[PDB]
Structures are given as structure tokens and as C-alpha cells.
Design an enzyme around this catalytic site. Sequence first.
Site, PDB file in Angstrom:
ATOM      1  N   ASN A  43      13.469  20.861  31.909  1.00 56.12           N
ATOM      2  CA  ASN A  43      13.779  19.583  31.233  1.00 56.12           C
ATOM      3  C   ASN A  43      13.128  19.437  29.832  1.00 56.12           C
ATOM      4  O   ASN A  43      13.113  18.336  29.225  1.00 56.12           O
ATOM      5  CB  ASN A  43      13.468  18.391  32.166  1.00 56.12           C
ATOM      6  CG  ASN A  43      11.985  18.253  32.445  1.00 56.12           C
ATOM      7  OD1 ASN A  43      11.202  19.183  32.182  1.00 56.12           O
ATOM      8  ND2 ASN A  43      11.586  17.124  33.003  1.00 56.12           N
ATOM      9  N   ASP A  76      -0.169  10.752   0.147  1.00 48.24           N
ATOM     10  CA  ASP A  76       1.122  11.393   0.447  1.00 48.24           C
ATOM     11  C   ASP A  76       1.299  12.728  -0.313  1.00 48.24           C
ATOM     12  O   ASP A  76       1.046  12.817  -1.533  1.00 48.24           O
ATOM     13  CB  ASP A  76       2.237  10.416   0.090  1.00 48.24           C
ATOM     14  CG  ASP A  76       3.532  10.772   0.741  1.00 48.24           C
ATOM     15  OD1 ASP A  76       3.690  11.889   1.236  1.00 48.24           O
ATOM     16  OD2 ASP A  76       4.415   9.948   0.798  1.00 48.24           O
ATOM     17  N   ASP A  78      -0.727  13.460   4.625  1.00 48.77           N
ATOM     18  CA  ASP A  78       0.292  13.539   5.665  1.00 48.77           C
ATOM     19  C   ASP A  78       0.941  14.950   5.760  1.00 48.77           C
ATOM     20  O   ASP A  78       1.296  15.382   6.847  1.00 48.77           O
ATOM     21  CB  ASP A  78       1.329  12.404   5.530  1.00 48.77           C
ATOM     22  CG  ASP A  78       2.000  12.364   4.134  1.00 48.77           C
ATOM     23  OD1 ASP A  78       1.662  13.153   3.225  1.00 48.77           O
ATOM     24  OD2 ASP A  78       2.879  11.524   3.944  1.00 48.77           O
ATOM     25  N   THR A  86       7.215  12.636   5.834  1.00 51.01           N
ATOM     26  CA  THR A  86       6.325  11.473   5.646  1.00 51.01           C
ATOM     27  C   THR A  86       6.202  10.546   6.839  1.00 51.01           C
ATOM     28  O   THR A  86       5.110  10.405   7.371  1.00 51.01           O
ATOM     29  CB  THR A  86       6.707  10.685   4.381  1.00 51.01           C
ATOM     30  OG1 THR A  86       6.563  11.567   3.265  1.00 51.01           O
ATOM     31  CG2 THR A  86       5.774   9.523   4.146  1.00 51.01           C
ATOM     32  N   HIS A 121       9.254  19.275   1.180  1.00 54.52           N
ATOM     33  CA  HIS A 121       8.410  19.547   2.357  1.00 54.52           C
ATOM     34  C   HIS A 121       9.240  19.177   3.573  1.00 54.52           C
ATOM     35  O   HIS A 121      10.327  18.563   3.425  1.00 54.52           O
ATOM     36  CB  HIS A 121       7.107  18.733   2.293  1.00 54.52           C
ATOM     37  CG  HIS A 121       7.326  17.265   2.082  1.00 54.52           C
ATOM     38  ND1 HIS A 121       7.636  16.390   3.112  1.00 54.52           N
ATOM     39  CD2 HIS A 121       7.387  16.546   0.944  1.00 54.52           C
ATOM     40  CE1 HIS A 121       7.828  15.179   2.614  1.00 54.52           C
ATOM     41  NE2 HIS A 121       7.690  15.250   1.295  1.00 54.52           N
TER      42      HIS A 121
HETATM   43  N1  LIG Z   1      10.387  11.766  -0.444  1.00 53.23           N
HETATM   44  S1  LIG Z   1       9.513  11.407   0.895  1.00 53.23           S
HETATM   45  O1  LIG Z   1       8.346  12.304   0.945  1.00 53.23           O
HETATM   46  O2  LIG Z   1      10.348  11.278   2.023  1.00 53.23           O
HETATM   47  C1  LIG Z   1       8.981   9.833   0.600  1.00 53.23           C
HETATM   48  C2  LIG Z   1       9.883   8.726   0.709  1.00 53.23           C
HETATM   49  C3  LIG Z   1       9.456   7.404   0.490  1.00 53.23           C
HETATM   50  C4  LIG Z   1       8.115   7.225   0.160  1.00 53.23           C
HETATM   51  C5  LIG Z   1       7.641   5.818  -0.097  1.00 53.23           C
HETATM   52  O3  LIG Z   1       7.511   5.447  -1.294  1.00 53.23           O
HETATM   53  N2  LIG Z   1       7.321   4.994   0.970  1.00 53.23           N
HETATM   54  C6  LIG Z   1       6.674   3.681   0.659  1.00 53.23           C
HETATM   55  C7  LIG Z   1       5.416   3.801   1.506  1.00 53.23           C
HETATM   56  C8  LIG Z   1       4.563   2.635   1.995  1.00 53.23           C
HETATM   57  N3  LIG Z   1       4.213   3.173   3.384  1.00 53.23           N
HETATM   58  C9  LIG Z   1       3.195   2.637   4.106  1.00 53.23           C
HETATM   59  O4  LIG Z   1       2.652   1.597   3.721  1.00 53.23           O
HETATM   60  C10 LIG Z   1       2.768   3.240   5.421  1.00 53.23           C
HETATM   61  C11 LIG Z   1       1.455   3.643   5.665  1.00 53.23           C
HETATM   62  C12 LIG Z   1       1.190   4.069   6.986  1.00 53.23           C
HETATM   63  O5  LIG Z   1      -0.102   4.485   7.236  1.00 53.23           O
HETATM   64  C13 LIG Z   1      -0.372   4.874   8.591  1.00 53.23           C
HETATM   65  C14 LIG Z   1      -1.880   5.270   8.618  1.00 53.23           C
HETATM   66  C15 LIG Z   1      -2.050   6.628   7.880  1.00 53.23           C
HETATM   67  C16 LIG Z   1      -3.552   7.126   8.019  1.00 53.23           C
HETATM   68  O6  LIG Z   1      -3.939   7.212   9.398  1.00 53.23           O
HETATM   69  C17 LIG Z   1      -3.789   5.989  10.142  1.00 53.23           C
HETATM   70  C18 LIG Z   1      -2.305   5.434  10.075  1.00 53.23           C
HETATM   71  N4  LIG Z   1       2.093   4.130   7.972  1.00 53.23           N
HETATM   72  C19 LIG Z   1       3.380   3.747   7.701  1.00 53.23           C
HETATM   73  C20 LIG Z   1       4.362   3.853   8.827  1.00 53.23           C
HETATM   74  C21 LIG Z   1       4.091   4.870   9.947  1.00 53.23           C
HETATM   75  C22 LIG Z   1       3.966   3.388  10.256  1.00 53.23           C
HETATM   76  C23 LIG Z   1       3.762   3.278   6.425  1.00 53.23           C
HETATM   77  C24 LIG Z   1       4.728   4.545   3.601  1.00 53.23           C
HETATM   78  C25 LIG Z   1       6.017   4.360   2.825  1.00 53.23           C
HETATM   79  C26 LIG Z   1       6.869   5.527   2.323  1.00 53.23           C
HETATM   80  N5  LIG Z   1       7.199   8.244   0.050  1.00 53.23           N
HETATM   81  C27 LIG Z   1       7.639   9.531   0.266  1.00 53.23           C
HETATM   82 CA   LIG Z   2       4.787  12.098   2.754  1.00 56.19          CA
HETATM   83 CA   LIG Z   3       9.098  20.113  32.560  1.00 59.32          CA
HETATM   84 ZN   LIG Z   4       7.869  13.703  -0.103  1.00 58.51          ZN
END
Ligand SMILES: NS(=O)(=O)c1ccc(C(=O)N2C[C@H]3CN(C(=O)c4cc(OCC5CCOCC5)nc(C5CC5)c4)C[C@@H]3C2)nc1
Ligand SMILES: [Ca+2]
Ligand SMILES: [Ca+2]
Ligand SMILES: [Zn+2]
Length: 805
Positions: A685, A121, A308, A159, A420
Site C-alpha cells: 500500500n 528562501d 527551505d 518552497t 529548484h
Molecule cells: N518561485 S518559488 O520558489 O516557488 C516562490 C514562489 C512564491 C514565493 C513568495 O513570494 N511567497 C510569499 C511568501 C510569504 N510566505 C510566508 O509567509 C510563509 C512562511 C512560512 O514559514 C514557516 C516556518 C519556516 C521556518 O520553520 C518554522 C515554520 N510558512 C508558510 C506556509 C507553510 C505554511 C508561508 C511564504 C510565501 C511564498 N517565493 C518563492
Molecule cells: Ca523556496
Molecule cells: Ca505498508
Molecule cells: Zn524559488
Amino acid sequence: WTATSGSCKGRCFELQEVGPPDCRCDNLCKSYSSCCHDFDELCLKTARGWECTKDRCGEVRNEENACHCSEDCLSRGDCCTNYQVVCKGESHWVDDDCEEIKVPECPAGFVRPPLIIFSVDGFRASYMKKGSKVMPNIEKLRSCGTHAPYMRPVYPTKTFPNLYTLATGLYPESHGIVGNSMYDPVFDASFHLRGREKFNHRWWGGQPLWITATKQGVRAGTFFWSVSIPHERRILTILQWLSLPDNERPSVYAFYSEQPDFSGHKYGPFGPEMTNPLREIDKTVGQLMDGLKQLRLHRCVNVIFVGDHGMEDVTCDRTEFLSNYLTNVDDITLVPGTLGRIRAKSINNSKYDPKTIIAALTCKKPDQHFKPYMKQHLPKRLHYANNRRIEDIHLLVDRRWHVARKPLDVYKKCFFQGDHGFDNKVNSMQTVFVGYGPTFKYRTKVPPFENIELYNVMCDLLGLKPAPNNGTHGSLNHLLRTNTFRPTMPDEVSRPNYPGIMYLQSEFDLGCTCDDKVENKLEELNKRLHTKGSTKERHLLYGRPAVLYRTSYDILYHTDFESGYSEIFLMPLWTSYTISKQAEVSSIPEHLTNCVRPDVRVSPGFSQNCLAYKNDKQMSYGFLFPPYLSSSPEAKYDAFLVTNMVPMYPAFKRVWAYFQRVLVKKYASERNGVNVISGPIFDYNYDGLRDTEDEIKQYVEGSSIPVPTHYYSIITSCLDFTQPADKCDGPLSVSSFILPHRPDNDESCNSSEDESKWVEELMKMHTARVRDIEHLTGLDFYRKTSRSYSEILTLKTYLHTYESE
Ligand SMILES: NS(=O)(=O)c1ccc(C(=O)N2C[C@H]3CN(C(=O)c4cc(OCC5CCOCC5)nc(C5CC5)c4)C[C@@H]3C2)nc1
Ligand SMILES: [Ca+2]
Ligand SMILES: [Ca+2]
Ligand SMILES: [Zn+2]
Ligand SMILES: *[C@@H]1O[C@H](CO)[C@@H](O[C@@H]2O[C@H](CO)[C@@H](O[C@@H]3O[C@H](CO[C@H]4O[C@H](CO)[C@@H](O)[C@H](O[C@H]5O[C@H](CO)[C@@H](O)[C@H](O)[C@@H]5O[C@H]5O[C@H](CO)[C@@H](O)[C@H](O)[C@@H]5O)[C@@H]4O)[C@@H](O)[C@H](O[C@H]4O[C@H](CO)[C@@H](O)[C@H](O)[C@@H]4O[C@H]4O[C@H](CO)[C@@H](O)[C@H](O)[C@@H]4O)[C@@H]3O)[C@H](O)[C@H]2NC(C)=O)[C@H](O)[C@H]1NC(C)=O
Ligand SMILES: [Cl-]
Ligand SMILES: [K+]
Ligand code: NA
């Protein structure tokens, strides 16, 4: 309810989720408040830590330890990752020389190389160079495997939208995860970062990789990890799963790290505090690679290291407040921060007007650090409109800034130094890609590419058929040693007509005039050959575009250009011309200023007319092949044909004329000739796809002449610029744009100035991929070149970004 009285014994990190109110032992149980009473004791052992030491070697198996250094550990699959190094004289994976992996070298019973996806991340692309001294394991994957200098995320560069794009190959508008915060008005429900609603399946569209694998009988490791499970335990669990029997063992795995994002928000992307999180990620990669080596899997598994989005310097004092622009600030709901989304506070207030909100936010302060848009006016490259969860009003925020509703929102909610979410073209938002393994290439650098492409490649690595998605399958074949996907060109659906001279001048009653009535077998046999396509090899360099839908159209040849003219839309679908380095710009002579000429190849009934433009007080016209670039005074008459005319607002004619009179020649001088293909786009659209005729919302008044929403150009030359565009032996170079066809220039705050101060900046904002234009027109370009098709697919996904190095 959960009856948490069952036990996790022998079930630790079980692969199938058991349904409530029975208790769970899977890697997600914590997040649901659902683990069995004994989950921590049995499944989250910590005793003695994460590494073997000298005196632990050969020990008696103490089942309470986090990992083991006893003799039976290899066959149990539960040694500490450094076991063979400390106890058996082995080297760490990072210390070994790299050696090409030509074929997968796997233990018996492995049906395919497993895939492990390691996601990080907030890992900004420049960390690969700037943190290289403190990341030895990552730097070895990078230099020995296949890497890009950066990978482009999707907008918004948040994210959850990016993780789900990585999982599905879809734009957020199609997968439904359009921000970290959302309201769905059909559900009347809200999605949030914190809380329960995000777990509801109705938010999540498309088909993610774990579902694609399962449906096709490839077993997947559970992708998601509860935050309190430490990194060391996630790695050990993956390694333990890799020791399962053949019939139970997954073929695809995922590890996710919250770092370096977590620290980057606190300390900024390059804060001195950022070195330590980078070290700790590298150490985790080291533990995985050492662990695979122990299991003799280090020359068998394909490993992807992928981020990401990146991270930018952003602080509390760089916030714009909507309360400094709007009086009615309490009648609005803002989704705030590095983007803005605005809607009415209440659906019962009929005095809320989006029109006046936009005007109050438009060009109001000299330094203004955000730009308001109706969603359908955002740059088409963002693909950010076709979803009921995306509010009509959008604010694009400058990099380094925030938008908020009132000052109270910031001080009653400086903490952060990084954030970001900005425009996905911004250098600080770019992220990373490395592929290492038997299926990836050896020591290979590949050009930057978009994260929407990766789902297809992950499917290829696992022998899966991808669900329908927004990648262009085959455009990343150059990353792979084998498992390539052999795409074929789409079949042309409509063949063109080739009309000759069929109409007399007096059959037309279009209300057009031209000063052209001035009267030799030398220059008469000459004009004949030019109308039959004698110069066609000059102006159409890559074959004619294929029309991929059912329609009626004509190819029209001229000395200086060729066009595919639609009898349905009454204008070209495409116009193709080549401008050499040597070409001269001339003016439109005075007597020809309002000249429009009937085309004797095309019926009155399938032609535009000048009367409609006279009666339409809002709409004027322009030309697709520009009269300024005519090869000779006589050739110039071809540019004034009614079949080369297109409808244009006067405000847009300023943009178009500057492009055609100044910029084309500039690009031809810089690139050593250019080939140009221009045309209309209709997307009423806002779905990113070509409209059918029954979708057109606007016509030139009192006619059936449809008004385009956008105009495109595709500008191609030789990548080796020592060769002219029209005699190029090797790879090509492209830039393209999709300009919005707007009745004002409110988008450009400096538009009262000369075009030389604002037009090129507008064009750069609306840069596009060839593939974006294909979706919007139903055309397929580059059909006849001397290049391999995969190389052409890569060219069509290229985006010219206009950011520095
Ligand atoms: N401040 S901020 O930046 O907003 C921010 C806010 C909160 C957090 C945070 O601690 N969490 C806890 C983390 C656990 N989690 C996953 O396990 C996870 C892995 C994954 O992986 C999908 C794969 C990724 C690689 O490619 C294949 C798919 N997909 C998914 C979702 C799409 C379905 C979830 C992402 C969760 C964000 N981090 C940054
Ligand atoms: Ca992120
Ligand atoms: Ca169109
Ligand atoms: Zn972040
Ligand atoms: C990027 O890649 C994607 C994936 O390839 C491309 O999107 C596809 O485009 C197709 C055309 O727009 C579209 O095909 C339509 O499917 C309709 C059925 O769709 C359901 O089934 C699929 C398959 O399982 C599923 O994926 C869909 O999921 C969507 O909807 C749910 C919510 O219900 C969401 O969870 C999910 O996120 C996704 O939402 C997205 O797509 C929808 C459109 O489906 C958008 O509205 C959302 O904003 C969001 O972006 C569905 O569950 C099917 O009903 C359609 O058929 C109609 O149109 C044809 C014209 O050919 C006509 O013949 C039919 O009669 C029918 O018309 C009738 O309905 C009209 C409206 O009610 C009505 O006016 C008429 O009078 C008729 O009664 C159509 O075939 C396909 O679903 C999506 N897929 C996805 C995943 O989004 C995308 O185009 C690519 N982008 C670019 C730029 O290239
Ligand atoms: Cl958001
Ligand atoms: K007019
Ligand atoms: Na303006």
C-alpha cells in the site's frame, strides 16, 4: 464583504485575528483585502527611513517617523535598531567578540528564552563559504553558535512543501502540501501559488508549531508576513512585540525573507547579481541582533537561521518536451518543470492507458534527461507516494533540466537562469542551518541532517510536547547544551523461539533435492556448537533486532550467519553475517547449483517448497546469506537450507547476485570488514510502513509464500577503519539500501550490459536510512552496543548520498 470603516489606531500588528466583516490590522490583512482604511498611515510609517543619524539624537518624538531617536524610545520599545550605536557610543553586535552563553541572561519576568526563527528562501548551503566576505553578521552566528555544513530538504525541493515540513516535522505525503501546484480528486479542487484556494484550511494537514504552542499555552507571534511589508518593518514589529507585558508577549517568533530565491531564479545561483541580495540579508540580521542587544536580549533569545532549499543553474534551452515522445499529448495533464506529474485530461476517456504512456517515456533517447516512474516505484528515501494528490505517473528530472508538455508552453507563458525542485540528494538543493543562543552549543559543528528533524528541536526549545511526526526525537540532542529529550528504546513485543532438531528428513515433501549424501567426534561436536550459537558473537555484533509487533518467529544459528525466521511469512525477517577483510569468495560448485535442503529445526508446514517455484513460471528464488561467502566447503551446505531461501524474479537475481558475489567483498576490503543484515520488505500500500499479512497482493503461484516488494541491506563497520568491523571500540559507520524487487530492469537504461556497468548505480539511487528500514519492517536495530542511545539515533537517521564533497 469587509466593512473597512473601523480604525487601526492603537491596534497596529494586533496578535489575534478579528473576524470579517470587521476590518483587520494584523500582519496578514493585505493578503485578504481586509485592512482598515488607515492601516498604511498608522501601521506602515516610512518617514525619515530606518536609521538614526547624529542630529536625530535626543529629538522631540515625532510620532510620524518610521522609528525613533528620542530619549523615551527604549521604554516605548520603538527606537531605530542602531539608536544606541549612533547616540550612546555603543558597538554593533557583529563587532563584539563572541563569548560563551552558559546560562540564559534575560530581563525579569521572562519565563523561558524566546525562540526567533529566521527563514531564508533559496539559500543554498555553499553560500555560507562562497559569500562569507559579504555576510559578517551571519558568519558570526555561524562560527559562534552551532552549525551543520548543510541541511537536507524534503522532496520535492519546492518552497511550500519545505516550509510546511519545517513547521510540522512531516513528509509532504503526510502533511498534504505535495507541490506548489495540486489537484485533490475527493475535493474536486485545485491548489495554486497565485490565488484564494490556498487559504482554505482543508489543504493543510498535521499540526504546525504555532498550533502546538497555542494548545499548550505558549503564545506565538503571527508567523506570516504580507509581501509588501518591508523587511525593516517586520524586524521592528518583532522587537516591539518583545516589549509587550509578560502576560501578552509571545515566546516564539518568525521572520521570512523572499531572498535570495527571488534573484536566484533570475540570475542563477552564482550570478554576479547575487552578491547584493546576500549583503541585504546580512544587514537585516545585523538590525535584529543590534535590536536584541538594545533590549538586553542578545544573550537570552535562541535564534535559528534556516533555509527551505538551494538553487541550481537551469535555462529555457534545457527543456525536454513530452510532444517528442508521445503522440496523444492532448489527452494528458502535466504538472511541469523540475519534476513531472501526469494524469488523464478527462476522467470520462477510458482509452487513456498509463501503461503505454510509461513505456513511451522509457529509455527512448540516449541522453534522455528525465526518468518516468509509477509513484510506488520511486526510491523509498523520497517518501513520495501515500497521498491522493500525488499522481500515479511521476517524472524524476535530471538536475539542470526542465520537463514541459509542448514547446508552446515555454515561449507562450529566456527569462529564468535558476530553479529548484529536484531530488533532495542533489548537492545544489542542500540548504542551511545555524542555531545561536543559551540552549544551543558553543562553537560546535554537527553532521548534516534532514529538515524533518527540526520541529522536535523547536518543541524542545519551547518546552512543548511535539505532535506525532517523522523526526526521530533525540537524534538532534547533540545540537543542544540543555533541554535534551531523553528517549528510551522501544519494548520488544514478540520473543523468539529457539528450536532444536525436531523433524526427520522424510517428513518433508517439498519437491526439493540436494546432492549432499556423503558421510568423527572432532567435526561432529563442532557442528553441534555452531547450531547452538557458538560463533554468534562474530555474526551478530549489535544484539539481535527487536520485533516490535505480535508474531511467531525462530532464531536459527549457523557457522556463518544467524537469522530470525518468520513462521507467518515463511522466510527470514532478518539475516545477520560478518565478512572480514581477509574473507575469500568461492563459487557455487556444479553439483550444488539447484540444491535446496530441508531444515530439521522447522516444520514442513512452516517451510517453503521447491514445487511452487517450478510451477511459477515468472518467479525464481535467491538466498539471503550468500553461498559465495561460505567459510568452508562443509559450512556451504547451511546456505542452501530452505529457511535461507526467498522469492526473486530472474531480472532481480541479476542485481542480487552481483551485490552478493562482487560488492559485499569490495566493501569488506574498503571498510576493513563489514557486518551485513539483509531481509525482505512488504509495502503493497506504499505507506512506508510494514504490511500486515492481509495486505499482501502477490504470492508464489499456488502457495502461501508472500512476494516482497523490496529487499534491504544494512552494512555496518568501524568509523575508525584501522579497527576491524568485529573488534571496534568506538563510533560506527553505516550504509543501507532498499532495492525494489521488480520483474524487469526497465529502470536501468544500460541493463543489457554487464552488471559492472549498472548495478552499483541502481543501488546508490536506492540508498536508505536505517530508520526507513525500521518503519518498513517493524524491527529495531543496534539494541546492544557500547554507544549512547542518542548517538545510535543519529546513526539510524544517517543517509549515505553518493554525491561529491
Ligand atoms: N518561485 S518559488 O520558489 O516557488 C516562490 C514562489 C512564491 C514565493 C513568495 O513570494 N511567497 C510569499 C511568501 C510569504 N510566505 C510566508 O509567509 C510563509 C512562511 C512560512 O514559514 C514557516 C516556518 C519556516 C521556518 O520553520 C518554522 C515554520 N510558512 C508558510 C506556509 C507553510 C505554511 C508561508 C511564504 C510565501 C511564498 N517565493 C518563492
Ligand atoms: Ca523556496
Ligand atoms: Ca505498508
Ligand atoms: Zn524559488
Ligand atoms: C510520518 O508521521 C505521521 C504522523 O505520525 C504518520 O502518519 C500517521 O499514520 C497512522 C497510520 O497510517 C494514521 O493513523 C490513522 O488515523 C486515522 C484517523 O486520522 C485522522 O486523525 C489524525 C489525528 O488528528 C489526522 O492527523 C489525520 O490527518 C490525515 O488526513 C487528512 C485528510 O482527511 C489530511 O488533512 C492529513 O494531511 C492527513 O493525511 C495523511 O494521512 C492519511 C491517513 O490518515 C492518508 O490517507 C493521507 O494520504 C495522508 O498521507 C486524520 O484526519 C484512522 O482512521 C486510522 O484507523 C484505521 O486503521 C486501523 C488499523 O490500525 C483500524 O483499526 C481502524 O478501524 C481504521 O480502519 C478503518 O478505516 C479504513 C479506511 O477508511 C477501512 O479500510 C477500515 O475497514 C476501517 O473502517 C489510523 O489509525 C495517522 O492518521 C497518520 N497521521 C498523519 C498526520 O498523516 C506516518 O505514518 C509517518 N510516516 C512514516 C513513513 O513513518
Ligand atoms: Cl509542484
Ligand atoms: K519459476
Ligand atoms: Na533496462
